[PDB]
Amino acid sequence: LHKEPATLIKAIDEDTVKLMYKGQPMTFRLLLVDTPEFNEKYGPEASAFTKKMVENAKKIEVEFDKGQRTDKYGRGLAYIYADGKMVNEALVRQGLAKVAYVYKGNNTHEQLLRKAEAQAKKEKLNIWS
């Protein structure tokens, strides 16, 4: 897999973000995660955490997997990195997301995120509390 440049346009919500990628505005949906909605418990905190992570980054990168790169809504499907730290993994590690939406061929970092979820769960963090 390869990391590619992008720039923040706007944080959106818990697990989507609007990035400029190859010069074009796109909404990205984070691979391999599911989050609470804004009006559910831990939704605001997921949203805030994603927002902070992307807004505070000096370098955003986009890493596509081996499979589908856009979903049925036109959202890009990637692993997103903020100063080298994976946002998808960070949300899971903090118990603000669960591993989810694991489709075959777009699952290179599954076991990495499952490990993260396991540690968040052990720690009883947030959604696991």
Ligand X SMILES: Cc1cn([C@H]2C[C@H](OP(=O)(O)O)[C@@H](COP(=O)(O)O)O2)c(=O)[nH]c1=O
Q: How far apart are CA 91 and CA 103, in angstroms?
A: 19
Distance of CA 119 to the CA centre of its chain: 18
CB of 104 to ligand X, least distance (A): 11
55 included as an active-site residue: no
29 included as an active-site residue: yes
Contact 17, 29 (CB under 8 A): no
Out of 18, 101, 112, 119, point to the residue binding ligand X (CB under 6 A): 101
Tell me: is residue 13 an annotated ligand-binding position. Answer: no
Tell me: is residue 70 an annotated ligand-binding position. Answer: no
Q: Quick check: 4 binds ligand X (CB under 6 A)?
A: no
Q: Quick check: 97 binds ligand X (CB under 6 A)?
A: no
- DSSP strand pairing (33-34 vs 98-99): antiparallel
Residues tagged in the binding site annotation for Ca(2+): 15, 34-35
